[PDB]
């Protein structure tokens, strides 16, 4: 029962220069490194939206569309897509620039939950979509939400 | 332990939750757990393929419970199914507290990783087939084939 | 966006201050901020030169304020001036708490890079062409700082 | 303090040799191996004591063979002997190539760590006794008592 | 070695250039060097203040020469001057090859770091004064005062 | 300072104990200390051999005392003895508190043994260490002692 918010309000991103400690013995980035970055972004989004303690409930469908080489800059951007009563869905996209041309590297839907200081699960501020796509993405989210419950 | 069997690649990892793993409250970031899970899966994949490997997808990462400062978590992984060009690996995370048995060991997270094998040039390679031997290995393999087909759809 | 303009190479980087970035109290080591600044500068240089680049000098690194655990820091760089063989890049670091009160300026510096051939020799550099008011002004101030530095590495 | 068994605390760890683990040639710094060994031993000690622990000594670290880029190394530890206030843990390091070569899994390193248990105030605590069960566990315990006595001497 | 003297806090650091320190060609990123320099400066500051310290500014970082793979670099720092609330530390970086011999130790970089001491609350504290003893210590102190005054002007 | 003498290779390293170095209580993982010690020993070995080097054995790592958050630790190494194909280096770790002062104390120590390798990976003869002072001759002697015993221990009866 707190105050609603918009996707622009919490929209967040993050830009990382693939360094050598990010990489496999060949030239590529461990999926773990990518996944951790994606979690960090989603967590920031969630935090902005709830202004509270948050935890990951589930991540569903992490897709690696392409490899990431040493010396790319990766942009990880997250935005809220749907809220239920007690949970938030956040879409995280990863793109890559070499420094070959900018491409989509990974994606995922994180699901977060808001916790009190005692550790109980809280009602979550509702997401209010405004544009066409925000209503569409919200709808698709409600869809993915229902199936996961099933 | 024969090659191409689950026992051959089965791998696990133990990690003492330290302070740099934690949120401002007592709990471990999902990203930390996820990273450790991918490390094990990749080790499994590498042992099985003896080649370069990359993550293709991770599906259904479930966090069954929080992990607090001073747990030891065990992340273990094992191959479940192979298609022609892809490997599915199941990763499980369990947690022991290390100060008090108010309760004991519990299941904290789980996921199915899917890896792919690459040549030096970077092309996708046929993958050594997994041969199940026990009851559960045949069952898990079957379930794997199931999850594989749906993902294609 | 035309090549050799500042917009062409303008680059930024966003980093979540994590625990390994920090001192035993709550704050980020200057070394960490300095490294991130260099990475951004380097990327700007590389975009503009399309070549191998190295830092020649960094001058005036100023830490305007401390950075906490759990800030996101934006590090942005842009080209300010070019001489014949050298590029000056301005790097700014801003910080947002996620923990909300007010984004602030945390650090700043002028990096000077030099473009290198495959053999490792210092090459003529593509000239920067300013377009807006501020770009001409910043270029002028750059020429200024460039001249003074050359005076600094000699006697009387 | 209730006694316990080797299987209870037995712990192991698997690590893919990455590039930041390596010398300028192909090989892993002893320090990296040493640090992974200490991590496992400490986890073993912790499981057994359920208390704060610190290393008291490590004796006889032997590097039987080099470890190259792209091995997976398994470091495994198990308790071997306990005195009244100290625990001896054996750590073994094995290596599998994950690259394709004619060359099997091999023993890379080994050591005996000695840990001690501390109270919250920081005093040295009596330690849960290790109770061996199999042939080898009694043998390894015996050997441990041997190594323990000599260390007390060589320290006189 | 008396407290508040330069010898008291003088600190150095030795680092083997590894492969994760390097550019795609053979050379060390300036960022790496800069971070190592800040670490040594910080330690010097800490030893002198026995308090929490942060970097206020770094001025004039000069890269005199490239550092390739397989050098050992020595980064050493010492206090040069103190004002009432700030400390100036000089950091010098030297490099030894460990590869082909016909290569003599050389000066690779240098800088003056300026640190400030903070209380737990985060307020700026008066700083213990540096007391020079030798010729050069008085000279370096003087030059410091000089650089300090100019920096106040550049902004005033 | 002549090559192949202990002064030539003597090396040291200073580290500010940070929070990622630390146990959940205030203390530094032995692994962290051990790694720093190996780094120093390796640098000493490298300086003396001007070649590729690897750790053969570390013997008798002693932890004389705990190290907590906000110490600066000095790890210093120096060569003590050489055989024909191996080098012994002594590493000592001291700790200064950097907060309200507990003075400086000895925290750990060890003898590392390194070996020099060619590009092919074969074990090379090693430049001999020439002691000059009293202690350098004494430490060299004690080194020869420790070397002989290790060859025995690792041999049978």
mmCIF file of C-alpha atoms in Angstrom, chain D residues 23-114:
data_model
loop_
_atom_site.group_PDB
_atom_site.id
_atom_site.type_symbol
_atom_site.label_atom_id
_atom_site.label_comp_id
_atom_site.label_asym_id
_atom_site.label_seq_id
_atom_site.Cartn_x
_atom_site.Cartn_y
_atom_site.Cartn_z
ATOM 1 C CA UNK D 23 52.759 -16.615 -14.647
ATOM 2 C CA UNK D 24 53.972 -14.959 -17.869
ATOM 3 C CA UNK D 25 54.736 -18.435 -19.116
ATOM 4 C CA UNK D 26 51.948 -21.008 -18.829
ATOM 5 C CA UNK D 27 52.071 -21.803 -15.123
ATOM 6 C CA UNK D 28 50.149 -21.144 -11.928
ATOM 7 C CA UNK D 29 51.775 -19.117 -9.164
ATOM 8 C CA UNK D 30 52.444 -21.219 -6.086
ATOM 9 C CA UNK D 31 50.700 -18.487 -4.165
ATOM 10 C CA UNK D 32 47.442 -19.059 -5.941
ATOM 11 C CA UNK D 33 47.625 -22.763 -5.204
ATOM 12 C CA UNK D 34 48.596 -22.049 -1.615
ATOM 13 C CA UNK D 35 45.694 -19.730 -1.117
ATOM 14 C CA UNK D 36 43.174 -22.248 -2.479
ATOM 15 C CA UNK D 37 44.687 -24.911 -0.191
ATOM 16 C CA UNK D 38 44.253 -22.641 2.814
ATOM 17 C CA UNK D 39 40.629 -21.929 1.898
ATOM 18 C CA UNK D 40 39.737 -25.589 1.875
ATOM 19 C CA UNK D 41 41.633 -26.412 5.062
ATOM 20 C CA UNK D 42 39.871 -23.569 6.803
ATOM 21 C CA UNK D 43 36.466 -24.705 5.667
ATOM 22 C CA UNK D 44 37.318 -28.188 6.971
ATOM 23 C CA UNK D 45 38.434 -26.669 10.289
ATOM 24 C CA UNK D 46 35.334 -24.556 10.490
ATOM 25 C CA UNK D 47 32.975 -27.476 9.831
ATOM 26 C CA UNK D 48 34.646 -29.486 12.543
ATOM 27 C CA UNK D 49 34.870 -26.737 15.211
ATOM 28 C CA UNK D 50 31.793 -24.754 14.379
ATOM 29 C CA UNK D 51 33.845 -21.849 15.723
ATOM 30 C CA UNK D 52 36.256 -19.132 14.722
ATOM 31 C CA UNK D 53 39.502 -20.671 13.439
ATOM 32 C CA UNK D 54 43.032 -19.459 12.482
ATOM 33 C CA UNK D 55 45.998 -21.071 10.817
ATOM 34 C CA UNK D 56 48.774 -21.869 13.286
ATOM 35 C CA UNK D 57 51.222 -23.423 10.872
ATOM 36 C CA UNK D 58 51.430 -25.124 7.560
ATOM 37 C CA UNK D 59 54.121 -27.618 7.221
ATOM 38 C CA UNK D 60 55.601 -29.343 4.213
ATOM 39 C CA UNK D 61 53.926 -27.810 1.193
ATOM 40 C CA UNK D 62 55.161 -29.891 -1.701
ATOM 41 C CA UNK D 63 54.702 -29.023 -5.335
ATOM 42 C CA UNK D 64 54.915 -32.344 -7.157
ATOM 43 C CA UNK D 65 54.240 -30.832 -10.564
ATOM 44 C CA UNK D 66 53.401 -27.676 -12.468
ATOM 45 C CA UNK D 67 49.873 -26.644 -13.291
ATOM 46 C CA UNK D 68 49.190 -25.245 -16.760
ATOM 47 C CA UNK D 69 46.556 -22.853 -18.099
ATOM 48 C CA UNK D 70 43.241 -24.671 -18.653
ATOM 49 C CA UNK D 71 43.498 -27.332 -16.018
ATOM 50 C CA UNK D 72 40.787 -27.876 -13.584
ATOM 51 C CA UNK D 73 42.307 -28.354 -10.173
ATOM 52 C CA UNK D 74 40.612 -30.208 -7.363
ATOM 53 C CA UNK D 75 41.719 -29.284 -3.904
ATOM 54 C CA UNK D 76 40.403 -31.548 -1.251
ATOM 55 C CA UNK D 77 40.895 -31.575 2.445
ATOM 56 C CA UNK D 78 40.189 -33.800 5.376
ATOM 57 C CA UNK D 79 40.979 -33.825 9.033
ATOM 58 C CA UNK D 80 43.744 -36.239 10.080
ATOM 59 C CA UNK D 81 44.600 -35.689 13.712
ATOM 60 C CA UNK D 82 43.576 -33.499 16.647
ATOM 61 C CA UNK D 83 45.469 -32.673 19.811
ATOM 62 C CA UNK D 84 43.744 -31.019 22.696
ATOM 63 C CA UNK D 85 43.860 -27.514 21.216
ATOM 64 C CA UNK D 86 44.860 -27.984 17.553
ATOM 65 C CA UNK D 87 43.629 -29.715 14.358
ATOM 66 C CA UNK D 88 45.706 -31.178 11.561
ATOM 67 C CA UNK D 89 44.184 -31.156 8.088
ATOM 68 C CA UNK D 90 45.579 -32.808 4.977
ATOM 69 C CA UNK D 91 45.089 -30.988 1.678
ATOM 70 C CA UNK D 92 45.680 -32.618 -1.673
ATOM 71 C CA UNK D 93 45.669 -30.893 -5.074
ATOM 72 C CA UNK D 94 45.008 -32.794 -8.270
ATOM 73 C CA UNK D 95 44.877 -31.503 -11.858
ATOM 74 C CA UNK D 96 42.862 -32.558 -14.929
ATOM 75 C CA UNK D 97 43.638 -31.163 -18.288
ATOM 76 C CA UNK D 98 40.452 -29.897 -19.920
ATOM 77 C CA UNK D 99 42.313 -29.207 -23.113
ATOM 78 C CA UNK D 100 42.844 -32.289 -25.239
ATOM 79 C CA UNK D 101 46.219 -33.947 -24.568
ATOM 80 C CA UNK D 102 47.759 -37.366 -24.017
ATOM 81 C CA UNK D 103 48.203 -36.819 -20.297
ATOM 82 C CA UNK D 104 46.109 -38.036 -17.330
ATOM 83 C CA UNK D 105 44.902 -36.571 -14.050
ATOM 84 C CA UNK D 106 47.890 -36.082 -11.697
ATOM 85 C CA UNK D 107 48.814 -35.097 -8.138
ATOM 86 C CA UNK D 108 50.081 -31.489 -8.105
ATOM 87 C CA UNK D 109 50.594 -30.484 -4.519
ATOM 88 C CA UNK D 110 49.994 -31.450 -0.915
ATOM 89 C CA UNK D 111 50.326 -30.127 2.598
ATOM 90 C CA UNK D 112 49.461 -30.476 6.274
ATOM 91 C CA UNK D 113 47.711 -27.410 7.670
ATOM 92 C CA UNK D 114 47.434 -26.908 11.425
#
